[PDB]
Amino acid sequence: EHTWPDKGSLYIATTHTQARYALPGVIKGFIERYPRVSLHMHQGSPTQIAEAVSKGNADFAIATEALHLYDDLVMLPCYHWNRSIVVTPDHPLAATSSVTIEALAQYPLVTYTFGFTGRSELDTAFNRAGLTPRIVFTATDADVIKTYVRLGLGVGVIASMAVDPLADPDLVRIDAHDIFSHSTTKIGFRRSTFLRSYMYDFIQRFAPHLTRDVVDTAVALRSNEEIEAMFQDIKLPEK
Amino acid sequence: EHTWPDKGSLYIATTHTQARYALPGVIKGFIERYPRVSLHMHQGSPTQIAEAVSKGNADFAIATEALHLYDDLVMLPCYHWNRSIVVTPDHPLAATSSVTIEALAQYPLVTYTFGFTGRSELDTAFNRAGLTPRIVFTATDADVIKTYVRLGLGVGVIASMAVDPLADPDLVRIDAHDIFSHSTTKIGFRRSTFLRSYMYDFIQRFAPHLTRDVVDTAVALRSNEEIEAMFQDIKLPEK
Numbered sequence: 206e207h208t209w210p211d212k213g214s215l216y217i218a219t220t221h222t223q224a225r226y227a228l229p230g231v232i233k234g235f236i237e238r239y240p241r242v243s244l245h246m247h248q249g250s251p252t253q254i255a256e257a258v259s260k261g262n263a264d265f266a267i268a269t270e271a272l273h274l275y276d277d278l279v280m281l282p283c284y285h286w287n288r289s290i291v292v293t294p295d296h297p298l299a300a301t302s303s304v305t306i307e308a309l310a311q312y313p314l315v316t317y318t319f320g321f322t323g324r325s326e327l328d329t330a331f332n333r334a335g336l337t338p339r340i341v342f343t344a345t346d347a348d349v350i351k352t353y354v355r356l357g358l359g360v361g362v363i364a365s366m367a368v369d370p371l372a373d374p375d376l377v378r379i380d381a382h383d384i385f386s387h388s389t390t391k392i393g394f395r396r397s398t399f400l401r402s403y404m405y406d407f408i409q410r411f412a413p414h415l416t417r418d419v420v421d422t423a424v425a426l427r428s429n430e431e432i433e434a435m436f437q438d439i440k441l442p443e444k
Numbered sequence: 445e446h447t448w449p450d451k452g453s454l455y456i457a458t459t460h461t462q463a464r465y466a467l468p469g470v471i472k473g474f475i476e477r478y479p480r481v482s483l484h485m486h487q488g489s490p491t492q493i494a495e496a497v498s499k500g501n502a503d504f505a506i507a508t509e510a511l512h513l514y515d516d517l518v519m520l521p522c523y524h525w526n527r528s529i530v531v532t533p534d535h536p537l538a539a540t541s542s543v544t545i546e547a548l549a550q551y552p553l554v555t556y557t558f559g560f561t562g563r564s565e566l567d568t569a570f571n572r573a574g575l576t577p578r579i580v581f582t583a584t585d586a587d588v589i590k591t592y593v594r595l596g597l598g599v600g601v602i603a604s605m606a607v608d609p610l611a612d613p614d615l616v617r618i619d620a621h622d623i624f625s626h627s628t629t630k631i632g633f634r635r636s637t638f639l640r641s642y643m644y645d646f647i648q649r650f651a652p653h654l655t656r657d658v659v660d661t662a663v664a665l666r667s668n669e670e671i672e673a674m675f676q677d678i679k680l681p682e683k
């Protein structure tokens with residue numbers, strides 16, 4: 206019954222983690238209220254996602270920091286998230302509170318790979334601690350990482366949202382927000398892109414704080430740095 | 445007890461699907477027989493995988509056809525595989541034998557994206573049938589695709605190995621090898637790369653037909669086209 210007769214299309218370019226763990230709840234809620242809106246989604250590497258929206262092959266770019274290289278157009282903060290190490294229940298780490306930055310580098314690691322979905326930090330957080338960790342697997346997603354944790358190739362380091370008991374209950378979850386700083390999931394779009402009402406509603410559903418007047422004000426400010434500074438005293442969702 | 449004291453390293457660059465559904469069985473069997481071999485794995489886009497091995501940041505490149513662009517160095521066929529459409533049990537297709545190329549283009553599609561893991565074929569198989577299918581989601585992996593099939597965004601088209609009952613049992617599997625031609629998973633390496641004994645054993649475990657004398661003969665033939673023609677009368681595994 207509750208249906209908006211809004212006609213139009215919405216092309217979303219994003220990554221695995223976002224489309225896997227952050228998007229599906231929002232996506233199904235969207236198409237159930239906008240049957241006349243043609244929704245198109247494109248998964249790819251974050252460096253290719255920010256190229257789709259610029260060149261007009263996509264409207265929004267829901268990915269992590271990686272859009273910062275592209276000073277091409279508008280960039281809005283959605284939510285913060287942090288990593289969590291996953292180990293077998295038979296692993297020495299499984300038993301510790303709380304693990305530490307130095308105590309994690311003593312094991313083989315299975316993390317994210319450089320640009321896709323949040324890695325450094327890693328290789329880089331360590332640089333800070335002057336550590337040289339042994340990383341034997343750099344994967345794009347977390348479904349791959351956890352499988353090679355069950356295999357025993359090394360200690361996995363994935364997003365917290367990528368772990369849930371009962372979906373993955375033979376694994377051990379350990380918080381590492383004291384170990385690694387949080388990453389900021391952003392949404393990339395253009396000033397030329399006319400923001401439709403179904404677009405505003407989609408953003409505020411993926412990011413409650415990003416209301417129309419908040420979005421418009423951020424667009425009004427002709428700088429991503431000014432936008433990122435507008436939310437200085439404003440708190441974001443933490444996953 | 446059964447341990448080879450072979451010292452050395454093995455860097456493998458691959459994709460999601462291979463590392464997800466084809467590699468883990470081989471990987472665990474490898475490290476259990478070569479404890480002194482330092483195994484390193486790198487997941488990435490197929491166009492970036494074939495760049496890792498060339499530039500020496502990886503030894504083997506276990507991915508699909510996409511290595512053909514790179515006439516840089518040796519390319520060995522491992523196994524054939526084909527797609528299978530996944531739908532909800534409440535979907536019209538669920539009920540049909542067997543679906544057909546024309547009868548699939550009448551629905552919204554959720555397939556692989558252009559270069560990563562086997563797409564065209566799609567967009568291209570159709571071209572052949574003069575069809576213009578509505579594809580609303582192009583994803584890198586199949587874990588993403590199936591989630592958006594359960595959501596109901598459209599009909600999914602993934603690898604057959606990406607489906608298994610009891611891992612994904614609320615979905616309906618339909619064979620499409622009569623619909624789409626099979627793809628060839630290849631392994632990319634260099635002639636300069638000295639093939640260690642643990643490397644030969646790894647290949648013949650991932651591809652039974654690729655024994656040492658078969659591998660050496662293919663390397664001896666200084667052309668990938670000659671290699672691909674050597675297996676003309678030789679049958680490959682079919683997944």
Ligand SMILES: CC(=O)OC[C@H](N)C(=O)O
Nearest residue numbers: 226227366411412442444
């Ligand atoms: C993991 C996740 O919940 O992502 C955040 C989501 N946009 C939200 O509804 O807050």
Ligand SMILES: CC(=O)OC[C@H](N)C(=O)O
Nearest residue numbers: 414439440441442443444
């Ligand atoms: C959703 C979450 O975990 O973050 C809460 C956030 N600090 C807020 O109140 O906006």
Ligand SMILES: CC(=O)OC[C@H](N)C(=O)O
Nearest residue numbers: 465466605650651681683
């Ligand atoms: C899916 C899969 O089995 O891949 C093929 C594998 N290399 C093999 O053992 O034949």
Ligand SMILES: CC(=O)OC[C@H](N)C(=O)O
Nearest residue numbers: 653678679680681682683
């Ligand atoms: C493993 C498979 O399904 O393929 C069999 C292949 N035709 C062979 O005999 O080599």
